Design a protein around this ligand. Structure first.
Ligand code: KJL
Ligand code: KJL
Ligand code: KJL
Ligand code: KJL
Ligand code: KJL
Lengths: 198, 36, 158, 159, 53, 51, 345, 148, 159, 159, 159, 159
């Protein structure tokens, strides 16, 4: 595979470069700490906010297509399900709204810091916190949406098979839909002590 | 789009609160022109 | 100021938080989705078996509670006005990896066992009990990642 | 080149102006292509539905409209000496609108194809498809909105 | 109120196997209602979202 | 105390942003290349036994 | 996982196929059909199912068991061909692979008729429509396999399956047709198993491997039992007919190849525990159909699988047979065996 | 969505107003609202003729919900008046509650001072202003929350 | 080499002049190839439609006209001592037209193949394919536009 | 930060605490999943064997207990100012137990699936499966022994 | 940290101690798994052979004994201030034994599966499988000889 | 650490000592596995050939002996203060022998499988397989030789 070959080549190049720097006495030249300290916290915060919204949306859309495509197929013979299983599509679109919400809350901390107080303890902490909280919310909402959509497709097919089945599969969705909520909560806890850039 | 997001706010947020549903639609025996 | 508490140490602590939450959610979602595809498949045949077959989804959710607990504990120890050691940050990065990947493994096992048992004990109602045992064994795998994470938190702050 | 406004700050904003259109046009193209495949498969049997199964191809284009809006707003905030914070904000605003539109388009396509294929058999399903499609479309909107909010901060209180 | 909503009606039914169905339905309804308050309050922000857009 | 003369923090930020973008673009293009037309509904049947 | 990428192309397909499945006649519906006193009553009862108004264009005097079978089969095949008209990529290849077996069956029906001088019109009427290819009626011109292959079947998708059928003599007869039909079903099943293993994702890879292993096992058992009737055949020749994908392979298939009597087949099947009682008692065909229905039912417990298109086609194909059977017991009035309608859904 | 339970509170009676007004909140423009009102009036005033003739599925749906669309347009006009949005522009009917500094130079960032409250609708003072979006977002988020 | 105008600034401009035409031509070639395959499959039965099923191959080539409009404009703003901001703007403009014309060409090819295949059976479908194709061809336009409105800023107010 | 005890030394030992539990749980989950699939396939016919075909799940679980024993021993030897040698030793122990448990769990899963599937037919095969599973389990114990004999040197004779 | 004995020298000894048991366990697990699959497939028909078709699972377990021997010997020669030459030697011994055991175990699994499957039919084949398996084991013993001859030089004549 | 003899020079020699036995064992294992599969497939019908179809397994074994001859030679020439030229030479010899043995073992396995499968039918084919196997085995020899002739220069005329 071209992708696997590229991955192996990148790994070999990284290993060779690291060994060359280490053996030549310059192992510290590969300083992830300096990279984190000198990379602008603005980049981390904005990447977090963009990835939060984007990944929450990606999971919502991914779930909506999985639930939506299985509702449409099952509704050819049982159109009664179309509106009944639409709650499934609301569990898929709600993660996105969580991400959006987080973006709004995290965007409030995207203030402009002064030149001297740019790479300080508070500003670097705010950058890391908003990057990783956005990553967490976005990935959790991605997983929750794709998983809730897979449950919603099963629920739609079951509802078409038998109406009484739906309420039993919706429970599973309610179990999955909480997974984004938890991520949301955890995100709010990460960026909780983060402050506007100053 | 806004007409259809109003429909969800009614079907999912408003009617989730009081609408039991699952009623029997009223379809009385009536004669209607049936087109071939 | 403190060389042992560099300002990038919170990056590692927040990476641990994200690993915990995201990977535990991935396990709980692999468990609830794959176990749920087994409960809907049987619904067409034994709808009556669906409510008892929610043990696998209940157990998968407890995997995202193991990662929520760990992430909450890690986040409570991260503050912009507190000296976070790069040791505390590595210890919170391992907490996240430990809980998240253990819960991912537990969620894959719970999705695989729940799905097949639910789709299988339609014919044999006696198999169900065994599922609950195996589902326990898988769930313990996540617990162990949680416990190790807790121990790694208690040692990161200290 | 100032501390806060390096020469490479415009790199991020210009990549955000591009990302918004490129990824909302990728999603819109995916949606339009799949919805058109479905429309061509169905209208062979049911041409009368054609000027009414065009809705998914109209929603995918609206995703492209959301990133032509974020792109044009981000391009007019781009400057030679604009701060790195502004550049990061403009990159984030294009990453958000572009990715959300990609997701929304990818979903609009898959769901429009299914709904046009099923509507040729069950007309009552048209309402179901349009409702599932208005929720795939709203994802993109939510990106635009975030992007818009980002741009509301991109140039303001910036030195 | 969460315990209230969850228990008062099923326990009233018990005190006057159907009680199992009543309890299951009440548990599902309570979880749905508690989650739906938040998910419905967040959802109505679509009004602002679409107006702004 | 610079990170590097060639791999400056600005260049690295630009490169990682471009890498994220290129990964997204690769995923999207892979997905779009997976677009297969449903021909069966596009060609006409030729079966006397049926259709 | 199965759900993530399955619905990008096959979500609508699986929904519609599972809707068709929900229309599969249940045991109660089969019993209701059994109580029908006439083919008119059978049509009325079927109208209450998802068959619906499929005989509405058929007059009372035109209702015959053959006509009912034809109409039900045509409905099934129209559904199949529609689902194919909505499928693409790997699924189109899979559904095309399902048709290649009907094509091998039609090639044998066409060439068997050509060697018996029977009219091409009747021979083509009896041919399975799903197994239609443009040059199928042209198999009614030549007798030797050489001309038929070099003129017709090279351009057909069956061409790769003509790699071991040239050994037989140029002159062609009924025994040679059976040999060619078994060789074409061995090569086909091996090719369809490889296609499933490499391209069809899991859990439709496992479900379709199991359902093709059952097909291969049934083919091997039937081939052995039919060769039993013949005076004698080279075991090496038999091995060239037995597919190599099933549970029987490679031990039970070998023992069947060298089997020369019914007790030999019984000994061969004793080792495999999935076909213990098939030859012990009862009707072997009914046992095979019941096992097939059980396997298809199991393929419906697994969602995000294109094995459900195969499981719906084979389930529905049994349903038609069942209806036909019932119709016969109503048309011919032999109701003693009416309840042998093999129902699993 | 579904058939109401026997003698259960009917959701159509409350939707008669709440479905158009929630749409109007989501729409909020006097120009678009007026265009939609005229489109609905075309069907309503010619309702007899349109009913007599045959209609396509989309046109039939539009005509059946002609009063729906009429209410949506009217409430959209009202909301856009409250949003002060007509074809993306604002109206200056009433004296603004904001007073810009007595004098300033071209390109000088000026901030207004609150001298009053706009009687009806959003003040036109923050039209085309840098911070206009921050006030609109706060107000409309809170409005959506309260209305929901 | 100035702070604001390094020697490597023309790299991004020259990469944009390239990328615009490169990706627009890739999309146009994809669209032309698939539409031509469809036209060759259909016109075997229906040659009379050929000089009218050539539309997708015309619409795919407007994608490359858009990429030539941006490459030619980006090229005349390329300079030895042109600012890094101008170079980044010229890269975003090429990527905008190029990767939005790739998507449009892919959509055009798929939709045109489907619509020519279906129009040989249902002539009324030709108008549906033309609408679906205007929505696909629209995407590329948007990228050109965002690419134009990025060149309007490339050399302006630049030191 | 000393020459021998850099600030990044705790990184490696922490990756060893994670590697021990990340990989022993991966192997134990693989084994528990495949053995459970086999048990569910067999016990449909032979429920009486269930409590006794659980052995592969018990064996896969002891693979995760091995990485918990190393993770908890490695985590109680971690420190803010612990030597780089100690960190490398704790990484090597975690890798040792984690990889050896992954391999053992894979072998346990495959062997247990095969042996439960075959034991429903040949009961005498059960003791044979238990022995082949004890051999696969043994491979995790060898990783635990190397990991435990690496922690015996992690903190000792270290400045 | 001396010129000849950097702080990172123990990194390669621990990775060799880990590699010694990590790859030898991978190979042994592969061999045990495949041989057990073969044993479970055969002993359904021929249980009497089971306690004699276990040889490949015993031969694949001597592969892990070879990596426990090198992991244990490499680990007692690990030190905080041990030379970089010693670290490279301990990495090369651990790679030698682990890779050679991985290959041996793969060969021992494939050959054992084939030979157990064929021995249920031709008992005379068992001797042939044991011979081909002795050849597969020598591939592992040769790696242990290279690894044991590498540790004889790891700490010796080292400053 | 001298200019010509850095501390990392032994790294290459150790990778060469490992590479020589690691790749020659990989090739030998591949050859032994495939030849054994062929032998097990054939000897079910023709056990009498078994102690004479073992040749490919004996030939694949010689591939590993070649890697052991280069690994034992490369290791006795490894040193803490051995020149970087010597390290590169010992890496090149180890690569040479291991890669050539890998190729030779792959050829040996394929040819031996084919020849054992065909020899059960045509005994006269056995001599031809031995001729093709002698040719595949000489590809490994030529590596060893190059490796040997590289070690003759590794330590010589080296400061
Ligand atoms: C989706 N995400 C999410 O948030 O899920 C929410 C979603 C819902 C609100 C819709 C969930 N709420 C729950 C609640 O539990 C239950 O109903 C039931 C029956 C729990 C009993 C079970 C099955 C216990 C198994 O673990 C046992 C045998 C497994 C093991 C290894 C052994 C032990 C000693 C368990 C240790 C921990 O596991 C402990 C038990 C866990 O400690 C953290 C805990 C107290 C979780 C929360 C449970 C609530 C009450 C589950 S899911
Ligand atoms: C790679 N081969 C290539 O280059 O082909 C060369 C020919 C070579 C063989 C020599 C081409 N010559 C042409 C010429 O026009 C035509 O034939 C036809 C019928 C044009 C009408 C069409 C289809 C119009 C659609 O776009 C409209 C509805 C699409 C949209 C989104 C709506 C708008 C408002 C966009 C308009 C722009 O699209 C505009 C039109 C474009 O602005 C840059 C332009 C003026 C292209 C050049 C056209 C020439 C005259 C096209 S292709
Ligand atoms: C995945 N969830 C999970 O974690 O499961 C947990 C939690 C459960 C309660 C849910 C588990 N608890 C157990 C408990 O024991 C048992 O049931 C049984 C029957 C144990 C006997 C077995 C089978 C022994 C085989 O190994 C032997 C022959 C294999 C080998 C190579 C030989 C040796 C000398 C190795 C010995 C070590 O193996 C030792 C034994 C192990 O030393 C670390 C240990 C003391 C594990 C914990 C066992 C508890 C008591 C197993 S699983
Ligand atoms: C998969 N898990 C695992 O690890 O299982 C562990 C733990 C189990 C208790 C569960 C194992 N314990 C054993 C024990 O022995 C045995 O049963 C038997 C019959 C051993 C005889 C065999 C077969 C010898 C073949 O090698 C020979 C002919 C192969 C070759 C090339 C020729 C030579 C000169 C090589 C010799 C070395 O190979 C030597 C033999 C080895 O030197 C390190 C050694 C003394 C291993 C220890 C084996 C114990 C006693 C095997 S497996
Ligand atoms: C799995 N690993 C492994 O080692 O298995 C061990 C297994 C035991 C520990 C149980 C092995 N012991 C052997 C012994 O040989 C034999 O039985 C026989 C009769 C070998 C004759 C063969 C076939 C010779 C072919 O090469 C020739 C014609 C090919 C070529 C191109 C021509 C030339 C001039 C090459 C010569 C070298 O090949 C030379 C011969 C080799 O020089 C290094 C050597 C002296 C190997 C060791 C052989 C021992 C005695 C082989 S395998």
């Amino acid at each position: 595979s071209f992708s696997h070959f590229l991955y192996y080549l990148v790994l070999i190049v990284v290993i060779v470069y690291g060994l060359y720097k280490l053996f030549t006495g310059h192992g510290s030249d590969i300083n992830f700490g300096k990279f984190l300290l000198r990379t602008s916290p603005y980049m981390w915060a904005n990447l977090g906010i963009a990835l939060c919204v984007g990944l929450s949306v990606v999971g919502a859309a991914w779930g909506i297509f999985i639930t939506g495509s299985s509702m449409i197929g099952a509704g050819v013979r049982a159109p009664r399900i179309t509106t009944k299983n639409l709650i499934s599509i609301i569990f898929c679109e709600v993660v996105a709204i969580y991400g959006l919400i987080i973006a709004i809350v995290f965007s409030s901390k995207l203030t402009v810091a002064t030149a001297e107080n740019m790479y300080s303890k508070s500003n670097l902490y705010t950058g890391y916190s908003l990057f990783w909280a956005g990553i967490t919310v976005g990935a959790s909402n991605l997983i929750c949406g794709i998983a809730v959509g897979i449950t919603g497709a099963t629920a739609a097919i079951s509802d078409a098979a038998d109406s009484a089945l739906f309420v039993k599969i919706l429970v599973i969705e309610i179990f999955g839909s909480i997974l984004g909520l938890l991520g949301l909560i955890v995100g709010l806890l990460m960026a909780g002590k983060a402050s506007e850039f100053q | 789009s806004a007409m259809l997001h109003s429909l969800r706010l009614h079907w999912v947020e408003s009617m989730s609160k009081f609408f039991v549903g699952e009623g029997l639609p009223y379809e009385p025996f009536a004669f209607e022109y049936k087109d071939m | 100021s403190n060389i042992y508490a560099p300002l990038y140490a919170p990056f590692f602590g927040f990476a641990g938080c994200a690993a915990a939450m995201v990977l535990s959610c991935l396990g709980a979602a692999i468990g609830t989705a794959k176990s749920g595809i087994g409960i809907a498949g049987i619904g067409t045949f034994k709808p009556e078996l669906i409510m008892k077959s929610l043990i696998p989804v209940v157990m998968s959710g407890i995997l995202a509670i193991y990662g929520l607990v760990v992430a909450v504990l890690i986040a409570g120890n991260l503050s912009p006005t507190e000296d976070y050691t790069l040791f505390n940050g590595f210890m919170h990065l391992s907490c996240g990896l430990c809980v998240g990947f253990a819960c991912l493994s537990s969620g894959y096992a719970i999705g695989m066992v729940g799905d097949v048992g639910v789709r299988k004990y339609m014919h044999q109602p006696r198999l169900f009990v065994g599922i609950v045992l195996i589902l326990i064994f898988s769930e313990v795998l996540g617990l162990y990642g949680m416990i190790v994470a807790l121990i790694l938190n208690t040692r990161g702050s200290e | 080149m100032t501390e806060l406004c390096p020469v490479y700050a415009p790199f991020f904003g210009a990549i955000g102006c591009a990302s918004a259109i490129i990824f909302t046009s990728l999603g819109a193209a995916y949606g339009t292509a799949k919805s058109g495949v479905g429309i061509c498969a169905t209208c062979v049997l049911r041409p009368d539905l054609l000027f009414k199964n065009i809705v998914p191809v109209i929603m995918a284009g609206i995703i492209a409209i959301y990133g032509l809006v974020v792109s044009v707003l981000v391009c007019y905030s781009l400057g030679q000496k604009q701060a790195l914070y502004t550049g990061f904000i403009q990159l984030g605003a294009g990453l958000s609108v572009g990715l959300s539109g990609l997701a929304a388009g990818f979903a609009i396509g898959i769901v429009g194809d299914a709904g046009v294929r099923g509507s040729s058999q069950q007309p009552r399903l048209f309402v179901g498809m349009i409702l599932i499609l208005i929720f795939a479309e709203v994802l993109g909107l939510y990106g635009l909105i975030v992007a818009l909010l980002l741009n509301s901060r991109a140039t303001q209180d910036v030195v | 109120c969460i315990p209230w909503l969850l228990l008062v009606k099923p326990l009233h039914f018990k005190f006057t196997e159907d009680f199992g169905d009543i309890m299951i339905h009440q548990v599902i309804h309570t979880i749905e209602f508690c989650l739906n308050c938040v998910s419905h309050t967040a959802s109505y922000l679509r009004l602002w979202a679409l107006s702004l857009a | 105390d610079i990170l590097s003369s060639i791999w400056t923090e600005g260049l690295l930020m630009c490169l990682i942003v471009s890498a994220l973008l290129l990964f997204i673009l690769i995923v999207a293009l892979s997905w779009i290349s997976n677009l297969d037309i449903t021909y069966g509904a596009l060609e006409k049947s030729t079966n006397p036994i049926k259709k | 996982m199965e759900g993530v990428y399955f619905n990008i192309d096959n979500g609508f397909i699986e929904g519609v196929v599972r809707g068709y499945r929900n229309g599969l006649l249940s045991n109660n519906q089969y019993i209701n059909l059994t109580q029908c006193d006439t083919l008119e009553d059978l049509k009325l009862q079927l109208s209450s199912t998802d068959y619906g108004n499929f005989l509405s264009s058929v007059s009372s005097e035109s209702l015959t068991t053959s006509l009912i079978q034809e109409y039900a089969s045509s409905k099934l095949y129209h559904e199949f061909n529609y689902i194919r008209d909505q499928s693409s990529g790997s699924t189109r290849k899979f559904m095309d692979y399902i048709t290649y077996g009907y094509m091998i069956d039609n090639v044998a029906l066409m060439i068997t008729g050509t060697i018996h001088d029977r009219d091409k019109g009747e021979i083509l009427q009896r041919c399975h429509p799903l197994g239609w290819f443009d040059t199928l009626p042209t198999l009614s011109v030549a007798t030797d396999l050489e001309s038929l292959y070099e003129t017709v079947l090279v351009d057909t998708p069956l061409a790769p399956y003509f790699k071991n059928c040239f050994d037989t003599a140029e002159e062609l007869d009924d025994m040679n047709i059976e040999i060619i039909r078994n060789k074409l079903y061995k090569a086909y099943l091996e090719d369809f198993y490889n296609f499933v293993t490499e391209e069809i994702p899991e859990p439709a890879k496992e479900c379709m491997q199991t359902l093709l292993g059952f097909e291969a096992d049934r083919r091997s058992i039937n081939i052995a039992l039919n060769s039993l009737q013949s005076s004698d055949i080279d075991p090496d020749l038999k091995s060239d007919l037995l597919p190599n994908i099933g549970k029987l392979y490679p031990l039970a298939t070998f023992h069947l190849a060298q089997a020369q009597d019914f007790e030999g087949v019984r000994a061969a099947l004793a080792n495999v525990y999935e076909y213990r009682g098939f030859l012990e008692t009862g009707n072997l065909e009914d046992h095979f159909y019941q096992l097939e229905m059980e396997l298809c039912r199991d393929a419906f417990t697994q969602q995000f699988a294109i094995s459900t298109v195969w499981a719906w086609m084979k389930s529905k194909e049994q349903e038609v047979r069942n209806i036909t059977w019932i119709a016969e017991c109503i048309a011919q009035n032999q109701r003693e065996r009416i309840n042998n309608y093999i129902s699993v859904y | 969505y579904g058939i109401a339970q026997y003698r259960e509170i009917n959701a159509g009676l409350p939707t008669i107003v709440t479905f158009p007004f929630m749409f109007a909140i989501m729409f909020g423009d006097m120009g678009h609202g007026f265009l939609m009102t005229l489109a609905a009036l075309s069907l309503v005033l010619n309702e007899k003729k349109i009913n007599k003739m045959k209609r396509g599925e989309i046109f039939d749906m539009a005509f059946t919900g002609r009063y729906i669309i009429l209410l949506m347009g009217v409430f959209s006009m009202y909301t856009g008046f409250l949003y002060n949005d007509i074809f993306s522009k604002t109206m200056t009917i009433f004296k603004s509650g904001w007073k810009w500094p007595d004098h300033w130079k071209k390109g000088e960032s000026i901030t207004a001072t609150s001298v009053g409250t706009y009687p009806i609708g959003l003040d036109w003072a923050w039209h085309g202003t840098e911070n206009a979006l921050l006030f609109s977002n706060s107000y409309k988020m809170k409005l959506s929350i309260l209305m929901g």
